[PDB]
Amino acid sequence: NLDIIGKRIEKIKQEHETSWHYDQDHPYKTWAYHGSYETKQTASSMVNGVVRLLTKPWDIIPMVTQMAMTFKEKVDTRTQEPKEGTKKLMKITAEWLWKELGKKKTPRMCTREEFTRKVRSNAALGAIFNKWKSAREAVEDSGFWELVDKERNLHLEGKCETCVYNMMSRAIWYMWLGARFLEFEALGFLNEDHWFSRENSLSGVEGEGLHKLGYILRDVSKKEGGAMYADDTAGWDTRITLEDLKNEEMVTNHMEGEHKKLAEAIFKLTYQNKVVRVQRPTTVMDIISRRDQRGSGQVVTYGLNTFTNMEAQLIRQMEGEGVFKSIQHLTVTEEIAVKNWLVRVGRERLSRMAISGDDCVVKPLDDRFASALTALNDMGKVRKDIQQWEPSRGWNDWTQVPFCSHHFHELIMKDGRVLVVPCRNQDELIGRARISQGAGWSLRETACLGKSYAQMWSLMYFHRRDLRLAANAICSAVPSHWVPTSRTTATHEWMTTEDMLTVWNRVWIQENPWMEDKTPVESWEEIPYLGKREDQWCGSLIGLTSRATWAKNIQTAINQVRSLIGNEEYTDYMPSMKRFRR
Ligand SMILES: c1ncc2c(n1)C[C@@H]1CC[C@H]2N1
Ligand SMILES: [Zn+2]
Ligand SMILES: [Zn+2]
């Protein structure tokens, strides 16, 4: 309690000495509350005019148009302590999992140099405004690094002064760039050195890319066993227990010297004890604390979610296979059985899973897994939209399994070769491409963001008639040499000025380990579409009068956008499609 968080609390007390008051009408039940102080401030979604002018039929589709318009009483809930048997299962599994992940890796600190480079090419590290304008400026000023230095030496002393969260089924905890640096220095290696790659972790998909995920699910489907299970957790980040945070901290057992000490401080002082500031309209700032739940940087959150999800799913697999009988208590001989299972078949059981943070697909040895719920429920990983003790429903076909907001189609090229392609409802794709975030977008910057969406569609969603046509239209409407951009940056092969046919050949043929025949594709007409009925099932407007008029008159839409942008060098990509090729 207050000995680890007090210093942080004390410091804030003073910067607002004119405003401090222990409010008696505070709305917190599960968060420990400390005090309040005076503020008065808040980021709505803006429309991308380039993409909207080239997607006119979707102007009358509410599922698209409603996306651009516009629970914190789930952050304020509590998880129960798991039973002794559960805690033992988790500790044995976590110990074994860090050793496996460590066999072909070496923990190490990330550098000021590495951090500086990340900030100087716009990765969302969730920082705040103050003393310097942007992150770009703070990193070049040596005063910052003295602030970082002061904190760094405070952490080696086992104490914290400035590592405080700012709150804003989503909840994002921004920190000041300094606290973010120290998190990255100690734990950045998990992402920077690919601990959750499929090669390293067997269950993981870190860095794999949307073009690989379907091939990975088809490889899991080839294993002998039961249905494919894809159970979503209800508010995963809020169900992370203090026992979870303690098993995650065991990565420090593989560290040495300074690194070990810096990493122990991040886990102890910032993850297993937290200090947060929250906007309350009644407008004040509330200084609240709690020991459990996930509140880390988004990138460390991804890696530790993947770890604890891999652990939870191996234990659910152990329950289905009868490795242990009850979660109340692991006997002496059950412990040795669990250890022996892990050593004997643990790596095989990891390969039966695809795990992306809180998102999983599991192909267990058989369907006993469906009704193996005691460990999963007692660890607090309660399933979404199903009653606590109702057996999971599994999927019989890998092409129907949801994963990372997609499903996957098997698509045969006219030349016999097999593509496994990513897909989702087309209203979701079009609605997202019509949205920008933040202020001060020039017309050129708005055009370059539209071009980023268009090139992603050409590479990932070429098989959707409407998206291949709209992607060609946007790329024809934006000057040929203008560089695609984003403001928060899977593997993004579409972020390039290289010709998209050359990039398609590299991704889907040359570098595709599931494609034996490396014969290059010479034109977009060799690249197939879904069946027309399947395209309609997944949200295509093919067949509607609105869509026919849009396609027939597309040059008029392209020319409207070219007229707004002005007298620039453009390329016509529409003749890459059979119907515009005369
Ligand atoms: C153990 N620890 C770290 C690494 C390896 N093995 C293999 C390759 C070369 C360096 C890095 N990746
Ligand atoms: Zn600190
Ligand atoms: Zn589909």
Coordinates of C-alpha atoms and ligand atoms in Angstrom, one line a residue:
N1 CA 0.0 0.0 0.0
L2 CA 0.9 3.7 0.6
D3 CA 4.7 3.1 1.1
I4 CA 5.2 2.2 -2.6
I5 CA 2.6 4.7 -4.1
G6 CA 2.8 7.5 -1.5
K7 CA 5.8 9.4 -3.0
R8 CA 3.9 9.6 -6.4
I9 CA 0.7 10.6 -4.5
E10 CA 2.6 13.2 -2.3
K11 CA 4.2 14.8 -5.4
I12 CA 0.8 15.4 -7.1
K13 CA -0.8 16.7 -3.8
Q14 CA 1.6 19.7 -4.1
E15 CA 1.5 20.7 -7.8
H16 CA -2.3 21.3 -7.0
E17 CA -1.9 22.5 -3.3
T18 CA -4.6 25.2 -4.2
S19 CA -7.1 22.5 -5.1
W20 CA -6.6 19.3 -2.9
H21 CA -9.8 17.9 -1.2
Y22 CA -10.8 14.3 0.0
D23 CA -14.2 14.3 -1.8
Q24 CA -16.9 12.3 0.1
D25 CA -19.2 11.7 -3.1
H26 CA -16.4 9.8 -4.9
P27 CA -17.8 7.1 -7.3
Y28 CA -15.0 4.4 -6.8
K29 CA -15.7 1.0 -5.0
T30 CA -12.8 -1.3 -6.2
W31 CA -10.2 1.4 -6.8
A32 CA -8.6 2.9 -3.6
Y33 CA -9.2 6.7 -3.9
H34 CA -6.9 9.4 -2.4
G35 CA -8.0 12.9 -3.5
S36 CA -9.0 15.4 -6.2
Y37 CA -7.8 18.6 -8.0
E38 CA -9.1 21.2 -10.6
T39 CA -8.9 20.8 -14.5
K40 CA -11.1 21.6 -17.5
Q41 CA -10.5 19.7 -20.8
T42 CA -11.5 16.5 -22.8
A43 CA -11.0 13.6 -29.9
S44 CA -14.0 12.6 -32.2
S45 CA -13.6 10.7 -35.5
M46 CA -13.3 12.9 -38.6
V47 CA -14.3 11.8 -42.2
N48 CA -11.7 11.1 -44.9
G49 CA -13.2 13.1 -47.9
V50 CA -11.0 11.4 -50.5
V51 CA -12.2 7.9 -49.6
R52 CA -15.9 9.0 -49.1
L53 CA -16.0 10.8 -52.5
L54 CA -14.8 7.5 -54.2
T55 CA -17.2 5.2 -52.2
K56 CA -20.6 7.0 -53.0
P57 CA -22.9 3.9 -52.9
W58 CA -21.9 3.5 -49.2
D59 CA -23.3 7.0 -48.4
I60 CA -26.8 5.4 -47.8
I61 CA -25.6 2.2 -45.8
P62 CA -26.1 2.9 -42.1
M63 CA -23.6 0.2 -41.0
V64 CA -20.9 2.4 -42.9
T65 CA -22.2 6.0 -42.1
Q66 CA -22.9 5.3 -38.4
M67 CA -19.3 4.2 -37.7
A68 CA -18.2 7.9 -38.2
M69 CA -20.7 9.4 -35.6
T70 CA -19.9 10.3 -31.9
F71 CA -17.5 0.2 -20.1
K72 CA -15.7 2.4 -17.4
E73 CA -18.1 0.4 -14.9
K74 CA -16.0 -2.7 -15.9
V75 CA -12.7 -1.1 -14.8
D76 CA -14.6 -0.6 -11.5
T77 CA -15.2 -4.4 -10.8
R78 CA -13.1 -7.0 -8.8
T79 CA -11.8 -10.6 -9.5
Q80 CA -11.7 -13.2 -6.7
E81 CA -8.4 -14.9 -5.6
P82 CA -8.0 -18.3 -7.4
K83 CA -8.0 -21.5 -5.3
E84 CA -4.6 -23.1 -4.3
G85 CA -4.8 -25.8 -7.0
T86 CA -5.3 -23.1 -9.7
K87 CA -2.4 -20.9 -8.3
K88 CA -0.1 -24.0 -8.4
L89 CA -1.1 -24.9 -12.0
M90 CA -0.4 -21.3 -13.1
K91 CA 3.0 -21.1 -11.3
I92 CA 4.2 -24.5 -12.8
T93 CA 3.0 -23.6 -16.3
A94 CA 4.4 -20.0 -16.2
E95 CA 7.8 -21.3 -14.9
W96 CA 7.9 -23.9 -17.8
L97 CA 6.7 -21.3 -20.4
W98 CA 9.4 -18.6 -19.8
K99 CA 12.1 -21.4 -20.0
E100 CA 10.7 -22.5 -23.4
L101 CA 10.4 -18.9 -24.7
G102 CA 14.0 -18.3 -23.3
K103 CA 15.7 -21.4 -25.0
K104 CA 16.6 -19.5 -28.3
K105 CA 16.4 -15.9 -27.0
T106 CA 18.5 -13.7 -24.6
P107 CA 16.9 -11.0 -22.5
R108 CA 18.5 -7.5 -22.8
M109 CA 17.8 -3.8 -22.3
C110 CA 16.5 -1.6 -25.1
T111 CA 18.5 1.6 -25.8
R112 CA 17.9 5.4 -25.7
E113 CA 19.2 5.1 -29.3
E114 CA 16.4 2.5 -30.1
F115 CA 13.7 4.6 -28.3
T116 CA 14.8 7.8 -30.0
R117 CA 14.6 6.1 -33.5
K118 CA 11.0 4.7 -32.7
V119 CA 9.7 8.2 -31.7
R120 CA 11.4 9.8 -34.9
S121 CA 9.2 7.5 -37.1
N122 CA 5.8 7.6 -35.3
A123 CA 5.0 4.4 -33.4
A124 CA 2.0 5.0 -30.9
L125 CA 3.9 4.7 -27.5
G126 CA 0.9 6.4 -25.6
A127 CA 2.8 9.4 -24.1
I128 CA 1.4 12.9 -23.0
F129 CA 2.0 16.6 -23.9
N130 CA 3.9 19.7 -19.7
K131 CA 7.4 21.1 -20.7
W132 CA 8.1 20.0 -24.4
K133 CA 5.5 20.1 -27.3
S134 CA 5.8 16.5 -28.9
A135 CA 7.8 13.3 -28.1
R136 CA 10.1 14.2 -31.1
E137 CA 11.3 17.4 -29.2
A138 CA 11.8 15.9 -25.6
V139 CA 14.1 13.1 -27.0
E140 CA 16.6 15.7 -28.5
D141 CA 16.7 17.7 -25.2
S142 CA 19.2 16.4 -22.5
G143 CA 17.1 17.8 -19.6
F144 CA 14.5 15.1 -20.3
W145 CA 17.2 12.4 -20.1
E146 CA 18.2 13.9 -16.6
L147 CA 14.5 13.5 -15.5
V148 CA 14.7 9.9 -17.0
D149 CA 18.1 9.5 -15.1
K150 CA 16.6 10.8 -11.7
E151 CA 13.7 8.2 -12.0
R152 CA 16.0 5.4 -13.3
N153 CA 18.2 5.8 -10.1
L154 CA 15.0 6.0 -8.0
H155 CA 13.9 2.6 -9.5
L156 CA 17.4 1.0 -8.7
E157 CA 16.6 2.3 -5.1
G158 CA 13.3 0.4 -5.3
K159 CA 11.2 3.6 -5.2
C160 CA 9.0 5.6 -7.8
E161 CA 8.1 9.4 -8.1
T162 CA 6.7 10.1 -11.6
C163 CA 5.4 6.7 -13.1
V164 CA 1.6 7.6 -13.0
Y165 CA -1.1 6.5 -15.4
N166 CA -3.7 8.8 -17.1
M167 CA -7.0 7.1 -18.0
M168 CA -9.1 7.9 -21.2
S169 CA -14.8 -2.3 -23.8
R170 CA -11.7 0.0 -24.3
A171 CA -9.6 1.9 -21.7
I172 CA -6.1 3.4 -22.7
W173 CA -3.5 4.4 -20.0
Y174 CA -1.2 7.1 -21.3
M175 CA 2.1 7.8 -19.3
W176 CA 4.7 10.6 -19.7
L177 CA 7.4 9.8 -22.3
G178 CA 9.9 9.3 -19.4
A179 CA 7.9 6.4 -17.7
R180 CA 7.3 4.9 -21.2
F181 CA 11.1 5.0 -21.9
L182 CA 11.9 3.0 -18.6
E183 CA 9.1 0.5 -19.4
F184 CA 10.7 0.1 -22.9
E185 CA 14.3 -0.2 -21.6
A186 CA 13.3 -3.1 -19.2
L187 CA 10.6 -5.0 -21.2
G188 CA 10.9 -3.8 -24.9
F189 CA 13.0 -6.9 -25.7
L190 CA 9.8 -9.1 -25.7
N191 CA 8.6 -7.2 -28.8
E192 CA 11.9 -5.9 -30.3
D193 CA 13.4 -9.5 -30.2
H194 CA 10.1 -11.3 -31.3
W195 CA 9.6 -13.6 -28.2
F196 CA 6.0 -14.2 -29.4
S197 CA 6.9 -15.1 -33.1
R198 CA 5.4 -18.4 -34.1
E199 CA 9.0 -19.8 -34.6
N200 CA 9.9 -18.9 -31.0
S201 CA 6.6 -19.4 -29.0
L202 CA 4.7 -22.1 -31.2
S203 CA 1.3 -20.5 -30.3
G204 CA 2.2 -16.9 -31.0
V205 CA 1.7 -14.9 -34.3
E206 CA 3.7 -11.7 -33.4
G207 CA 5.0 -10.2 -36.7
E208 CA 3.2 -12.8 -38.8
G209 CA 1.0 -10.5 -41.0
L210 CA -2.7 -10.9 -42.0
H211 CA -1.6 -12.7 -45.2
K212 CA -0.1 -15.5 -43.0
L213 CA -2.9 -15.9 -40.3
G214 CA -5.2 -18.0 -42.6
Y215 CA -2.4 -20.4 -43.6
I216 CA -1.5 -20.7 -39.8
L217 CA -5.2 -21.6 -38.9
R218 CA -5.3 -24.2 -41.9
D219 CA -2.0 -25.8 -40.5
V220 CA -3.7 -26.1 -37.0
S221 CA -6.8 -27.6 -38.7
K222 CA -4.5 -30.4 -40.1
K223 CA -3.7 -31.8 -36.6
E224 CA -5.8 -34.7 -35.4
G225 CA -8.3 -33.6 -32.6
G226 CA -11.7 -32.1 -31.9
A227 CA -13.4 -28.8 -33.0
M228 CA -11.6 -25.5 -33.2
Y229 CA -12.5 -23.3 -30.2
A230 CA -12.3 -19.5 -30.3
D231 CA -13.8 -18.3 -27.0
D232 CA -13.5 -14.5 -26.4
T233 CA -12.9 -13.4 -22.8
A234 CA -15.2 -10.7 -21.3
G235 CA -12.9 -7.6 -20.7
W236 CA -9.5 -9.6 -20.6
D237 CA -7.5 -6.6 -19.2
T238 CA -9.9 -6.3 -16.2
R239 CA -9.5 -10.1 -15.4
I240 CA -5.7 -10.0 -15.0
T241 CA -5.2 -11.1 -11.3
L242 CA -2.3 -10.2 -9.0
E243 CA -1.3 -13.9 -9.4
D244 CA -1.1 -13.4 -13.2
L245 CA 1.2 -10.2 -12.7
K246 CA 3.4 -12.4 -10.3
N247 CA 3.7 -15.2 -12.9
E248 CA 4.5 -12.6 -15.7
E249 CA 7.3 -11.1 -13.4
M250 CA 9.1 -14.5 -13.4
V251 CA 10.7 -13.4 -16.8
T252 CA 13.1 -11.4 -14.4
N253 CA 14.4 -14.9 -13.3
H254 CA 16.1 -15.1 -16.8
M255 CA 17.8 -11.6 -16.5
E256 CA 21.0 -10.5 -14.7
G257 CA 22.8 -7.4 -13.3
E258 CA 21.2 -3.9 -13.9
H259 CA 18.5 -5.2 -16.3
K260 CA 17.1 -7.6 -13.7
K261 CA 16.8 -4.7 -11.2
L262 CA 15.3 -2.3 -13.7
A263 CA 12.7 -5.0 -14.8
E264 CA 11.8 -5.9 -11.2
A265 CA 11.1 -2.2 -10.5
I266 CA 8.7 -1.9 -13.5
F267 CA 6.7 -5.0 -12.4
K268 CA 6.7 -4.2 -8.6
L269 CA 6.3 -0.4 -8.7
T270 CA 4.2 0.3 -11.9
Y271 CA 2.3 -3.0 -12.7
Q272 CA 1.6 -4.7 -9.3
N273 CA 1.0 -1.1 -7.8
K274 CA -0.5 1.6 -10.0
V275 CA -1.4 5.3 -9.6
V276 CA -3.9 6.7 -12.1
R277 CA -5.5 10.2 -12.8
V278 CA -9.1 10.1 -14.2
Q279 CA -11.4 12.9 -15.7
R280 CA -14.7 13.3 -13.7
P281 CA -17.3 15.7 -15.1
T282 CA -18.8 16.4 -11.6
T283 CA -14.5 18.7 -14.0
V284 CA -11.9 17.4 -11.4
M285 CA -9.0 14.9 -11.6
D286 CA -9.2 11.8 -9.3
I287 CA -6.0 10.1 -8.0
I288 CA -6.9 6.4 -7.6
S289 CA -4.7 3.3 -7.0
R290 CA -5.1 -0.5 -7.4
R291 CA -2.8 -3.6 -7.4
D292 CA -4.3 -5.8 -10.2
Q293 CA -5.7 -5.6 -13.8
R294 CA -3.6 -4.7 -16.9
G295 CA -2.3 -1.2 -17.3
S296 CA 1.0 -1.2 -19.2
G297 CA 2.1 0.3 -22.5
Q298 CA 0.0 -1.2 -25.4
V299 CA 3.1 -3.1 -26.8
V300 CA 4.2 -4.7 -23.4
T301 CA 0.4 -5.4 -22.8
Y302 CA 0.2 -7.4 -26.1
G303 CA 3.2 -9.6 -25.1
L304 CA 2.1 -10.3 -21.5
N305 CA -1.5 -10.9 -22.7
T306 CA -0.1 -13.4 -25.2
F307 CA 2.0 -15.1 -22.4
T308 CA -0.9 -15.4 -19.8
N309 CA -3.4 -16.5 -22.6
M310 CA -0.9 -19.2 -23.7
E311 CA -0.7 -20.3 -20.0
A312 CA -4.5 -20.3 -19.4
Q313 CA -5.2 -22.2 -22.7
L314 CA -2.5 -25.0 -21.8
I315 CA -4.2 -25.4 -18.4
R316 CA -7.7 -25.6 -20.0
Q317 CA -6.1 -28.3 -22.3
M318 CA -4.7 -30.1 -19.2
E319 CA -8.2 -30.0 -17.6
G320 CA -9.8 -31.6 -20.7
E321 CA -7.2 -34.3 -20.9
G322 CA -7.7 -35.2 -17.2
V323 CA -4.1 -34.3 -16.1
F324 CA -5.6 -32.9 -12.8
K325 CA -9.0 -33.7 -11.2
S326 CA -9.8 -30.6 -9.1
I327 CA -8.7 -26.9 -8.8
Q328 CA -9.2 -26.9 -4.9
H329 CA -5.8 -28.7 -4.4
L330 CA -3.0 -30.2 -6.6
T331 CA -1.7 -33.4 -4.8
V332 CA 2.1 -34.2 -4.8
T333 CA 1.6 -36.7 -7.7
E334 CA -0.7 -34.3 -9.7
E335 CA 2.2 -31.7 -9.7
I336 CA 4.7 -34.3 -11.1
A337 CA 2.0 -35.4 -13.7
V338 CA 1.5 -31.7 -14.8
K339 CA 5.3 -31.2 -15.0
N340 CA 5.6 -34.5 -17.0
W341 CA 2.8 -33.5 -19.4
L342 CA 4.6 -30.1 -20.1
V343 CA 8.0 -31.8 -20.7
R344 CA 6.4 -34.7 -22.8
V345 CA 3.7 -32.9 -24.9
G346 CA 3.8 -29.1 -23.9
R347 CA 5.4 -28.0 -27.2
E348 CA 2.9 -30.2 -29.3
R349 CA 0.0 -28.6 -27.3
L350 CA 1.3 -25.0 -28.0
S351 CA 1.4 -25.8 -31.7
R352 CA -2.4 -26.6 -31.5
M353 CA -3.0 -22.9 -30.7
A354 CA -3.0 -19.5 -32.5
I355 CA -2.8 -16.7 -29.8
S356 CA -2.7 -12.9 -30.4
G357 CA -3.0 -11.2 -27.0
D358 CA -6.5 -11.9 -25.5
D359 CA -7.5 -13.6 -28.9
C360 CA -7.1 -17.4 -29.2
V361 CA -7.9 -20.4 -31.4
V362 CA -7.3 -23.8 -29.9
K363 CA -7.6 -27.3 -31.6
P364 CA -7.5 -29.6 -28.6
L365 CA -6.8 -33.3 -28.6
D366 CA -10.6 -34.0 -28.4
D367 CA -13.9 -32.2 -27.5
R368 CA -13.6 -32.8 -23.6
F369 CA -12.0 -29.3 -23.7
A370 CA -15.5 -27.8 -24.5
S371 CA -16.8 -28.7 -21.0
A372 CA -13.4 -28.1 -19.1
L373 CA -14.4 -24.8 -17.4
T374 CA -13.3 -24.9 -13.7
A375 CA -9.7 -23.7 -14.1
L376 CA -10.7 -21.1 -16.9
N377 CA -13.5 -19.7 -14.7
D378 CA -11.4 -19.8 -11.4
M379 CA -8.4 -18.0 -13.2
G380 CA -11.0 -15.2 -13.9
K381 CA -10.9 -15.7 -17.7
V382 CA -14.8 -15.9 -17.9
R383 CA -16.1 -16.3 -21.5
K384 CA -18.1 -13.5 -23.3
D385 CA -21.8 -14.1 -24.3
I386 CA -22.3 -17.7 -22.8
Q387 CA -23.4 -18.8 -19.3
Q388 CA -20.6 -19.6 -17.0
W389 CA -21.0 -23.5 -17.0
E390 CA -22.5 -23.9 -20.6
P391 CA -20.0 -25.9 -22.8
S392 CA -18.2 -24.0 -25.5
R393 CA -19.4 -24.4 -29.1
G394 CA -16.5 -25.2 -31.5
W395 CA -16.1 -24.7 -35.2
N396 CA -16.0 -27.7 -37.6
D397 CA -14.3 -25.8 -40.5
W398 CA -11.2 -23.6 -40.2
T399 CA -12.7 -21.2 -42.8
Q400 CA -15.5 -20.3 -40.3
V401 CA -13.3 -19.6 -37.3
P402 CA -13.0 -15.9 -36.2
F403 CA -9.4 -14.7 -35.4
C404 CA -8.0 -11.1 -35.1
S405 CA -11.4 -9.7 -36.4
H406 CA -11.2 -11.8 -39.6
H407 CA -12.2 -15.1 -41.2
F408 CA -10.2 -16.8 -44.0
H409 CA -11.2 -18.2 -47.4
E410 CA -9.4 -20.8 -49.6
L411 CA -9.2 -19.3 -53.1
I412 CA -8.0 -21.3 -56.1
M413 CA -6.1 -19.3 -58.9
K414 CA -7.0 -20.1 -62.5
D415 CA -3.5 -21.8 -62.7
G416 CA -4.4 -24.2 -59.8
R417 CA -2.3 -22.6 -57.0
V418 CA -4.0 -22.0 -53.6
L419 CA -4.3 -18.6 -51.8
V420 CA -5.6 -18.5 -48.2
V421 CA -6.9 -14.9 -47.9
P422 CA -8.1 -12.7 -45.0
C423 CA -11.8 -11.4 -45.0
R424 CA -14.3 -9.5 -42.9
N425 CA -17.7 -7.9 -43.5
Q426 CA -17.0 -5.2 -46.2
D427 CA -19.1 -2.6 -44.4
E428 CA -16.5 -2.7 -41.6
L429 CA -13.6 -2.2 -44.1
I430 CA -15.2 0.7 -46.0
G431 CA -16.5 2.4 -42.8
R432 CA -12.9 2.3 -41.2
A433 CA -11.2 3.7 -44.4
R434 CA -13.7 6.7 -44.3
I435 CA -12.4 7.7 -40.8
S436 CA -9.3 9.8 -39.8
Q437 CA -8.1 10.6 -36.2
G438 CA -6.7 14.1 -35.1
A439 CA -6.7 17.7 -36.3
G440 CA -4.7 19.8 -38.9
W441 CA -4.9 17.3 -41.8
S442 CA -4.0 19.0 -45.1
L443 CA -5.7 17.7 -48.4
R444 CA -2.4 16.0 -49.3
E445 CA -2.1 14.2 -45.9
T446 CA -5.8 13.1 -46.2
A447 CA -5.1 11.8 -49.8
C448 CA -2.0 9.9 -48.6
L449 CA -4.0 8.2 -45.8
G450 CA -6.7 7.2 -48.4
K451 CA -3.9 5.7 -50.5
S452 CA -2.6 3.7 -47.5
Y453 CA -6.2 2.1 -47.1
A454 CA -6.3 1.6 -51.0
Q455 CA -2.9 -0.3 -51.1
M456 CA -3.9 -2.4 -48.0
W457 CA -7.1 -3.4 -49.9
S458 CA -5.1 -4.3 -53.1
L459 CA -2.7 -6.6 -51.0
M460 CA -5.1 -8.2 -48.4
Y461 CA -8.7 -7.8 -49.9
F462 CA -8.0 -8.0 -53.7
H463 CA -10.6 -10.9 -53.8
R464 CA -13.5 -8.5 -52.9
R465 CA -14.8 -7.0 -56.2
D466 CA -15.9 -3.7 -54.6
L467 CA -12.5 -3.2 -52.8
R468 CA -10.3 -4.0 -55.8
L469 CA -12.3 -1.4 -57.9
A470 CA -12.3 1.2 -55.1
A471 CA -8.6 0.7 -54.4
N472 CA -7.8 1.2 -58.1
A473 CA -10.1 4.3 -58.1
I474 CA -8.3 5.9 -55.0
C475 CA -4.8 5.1 -56.5
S476 CA -5.9 6.7 -59.8
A477 CA -7.2 9.8 -57.9
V478 CA -4.1 10.5 -55.7
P479 CA -0.9 11.7 -57.4
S480 CA 1.3 8.6 -58.4
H481 CA 4.4 9.6 -56.4
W482 CA 2.7 10.8 -53.1
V483 CA 3.8 8.5 -50.3
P484 CA 1.1 6.6 -48.2
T485 CA 1.0 7.7 -44.5
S486 CA -0.6 6.8 -41.1
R487 CA -0.5 8.5 -37.6
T488 CA -0.4 5.1 -35.6
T489 CA 1.6 2.3 -37.4
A490 CA 0.7 -7.2 -38.4
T491 CA 3.4 -6.3 -41.1
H492 CA 2.5 -3.2 -43.3
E493 CA 3.8 -4.2 -46.8
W494 CA 1.3 -1.7 -48.4
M495 CA 3.2 1.3 -46.9
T496 CA 5.4 1.8 -50.0
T497 CA 5.6 3.6 -53.4
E498 CA 6.6 0.4 -55.1
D499 CA 4.1 -0.9 -57.8
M500 CA 1.4 -2.9 -56.0
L501 CA 1.6 -5.9 -58.5
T502 CA 5.3 -6.3 -57.6
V503 CA 4.5 -6.2 -53.8
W504 CA 1.6 -8.7 -54.4
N505 CA 4.0 -11.1 -56.2
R506 CA 6.6 -10.8 -53.3
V507 CA 4.0 -11.3 -50.5
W508 CA 1.7 -14.0 -52.1
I509 CA 4.2 -15.9 -54.3
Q510 CA 8.0 -15.3 -53.7
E511 CA 8.1 -15.1 -49.8
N512 CA 5.0 -17.3 -49.2
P513 CA 6.3 -20.6 -47.6
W514 CA 3.0 -22.4 -48.4
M515 CA 3.4 -21.7 -52.3
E516 CA 5.8 -24.3 -53.9
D517 CA 5.5 -23.0 -57.5
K518 CA 7.2 -19.5 -57.6
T519 CA 6.0 -18.5 -61.2
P520 CA 5.4 -14.7 -61.0
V521 CA 1.9 -13.3 -61.8
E522 CA 2.2 -10.9 -64.9
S523 CA -1.1 -9.0 -64.4
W524 CA -4.0 -8.3 -61.9
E525 CA -6.3 -10.3 -64.2
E526 CA -4.5 -13.6 -63.1
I527 CA -5.4 -12.8 -59.5
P528 CA -8.8 -14.3 -58.6
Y529 CA -12.0 -13.0 -56.7
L530 CA -14.2 -14.9 -54.2
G531 CA -17.3 -16.5 -55.8
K532 CA -19.9 -13.8 -56.6
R533 CA -22.4 -15.3 -54.1
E534 CA -19.6 -15.5 -51.4
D535 CA -18.6 -11.9 -52.1
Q536 CA -22.3 -10.9 -51.5
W537 CA -22.4 -13.0 -48.3
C538 CA -19.4 -11.0 -47.0
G539 CA -21.1 -7.6 -47.8
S540 CA -20.5 -6.9 -51.5
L541 CA -22.9 -4.5 -53.3
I542 CA -22.3 -6.4 -56.6
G543 CA -25.8 -6.8 -58.2
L544 CA -27.3 -3.4 -56.8
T545 CA -28.1 -0.5 -59.2
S546 CA -26.2 2.0 -57.0
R547 CA -23.0 -0.2 -57.4
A548 CA -23.5 -0.7 -61.2
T549 CA -23.7 3.2 -61.7
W550 CA -20.7 3.8 -59.5
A551 CA -18.5 1.2 -61.4
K552 CA -19.7 2.4 -64.9
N553 CA -19.1 6.1 -64.0
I554 CA -15.9 5.6 -61.9
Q555 CA -13.7 7.9 -64.1
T556 CA -16.2 10.8 -63.3
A557 CA -15.5 10.2 -59.5
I558 CA -11.8 9.9 -60.0
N559 CA -11.8 13.2 -62.0
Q560 CA -13.8 15.0 -59.2
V561 CA -11.0 14.1 -56.7
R562 CA -8.2 15.0 -59.2
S563 CA -9.9 18.4 -59.8
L564 CA -9.9 19.1 -55.9
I565 CA -6.2 18.0 -55.5
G566 CA -5.2 20.0 -58.6
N567 CA -2.7 19.8 -61.5
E568 CA -0.5 16.9 -60.3
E569 CA 0.9 13.7 -62.1
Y570 CA -1.7 10.9 -61.9
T571 CA -1.7 7.3 -63.3
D572 CA -4.9 5.5 -64.6
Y573 CA -5.0 2.1 -62.8
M574 CA -8.6 1.2 -63.9
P575 CA -7.4 -0.7 -67.1
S576 CA -5.7 -3.3 -64.8
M577 CA -9.3 -4.6 -64.5
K578 CA -10.8 -6.6 -67.5
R579 CA -14.0 -4.4 -67.7
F580 CA -12.1 -1.0 -68.1
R581 CA -9.4 -2.6 -70.4
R582 CA -11.5 -1.2 -73.3
Ligands
LIG1 C1 19.7 -17.0 -28.5 N1 19.7 -15.8 -28.0 C2 19.5 -14.8 -28.9 C3 19.5 -15.0 -30.3 C4 19.6 -16.4 -30.7 N2 19.7 -17.4 -29.8 C5 19.6 -16.7 -32.2 C6 19.6 -15.5 -33.0 C7 21.0 -14.8 -33.0 C8 20.9 -13.7 -31.9 C9 19.4 -13.9 -31.3 N3 18.7 -14.5 -32.5
ZN2 ZN 8.8 5.3 -11.6
ZN3 ZN -15.5 -13.5 -46.2

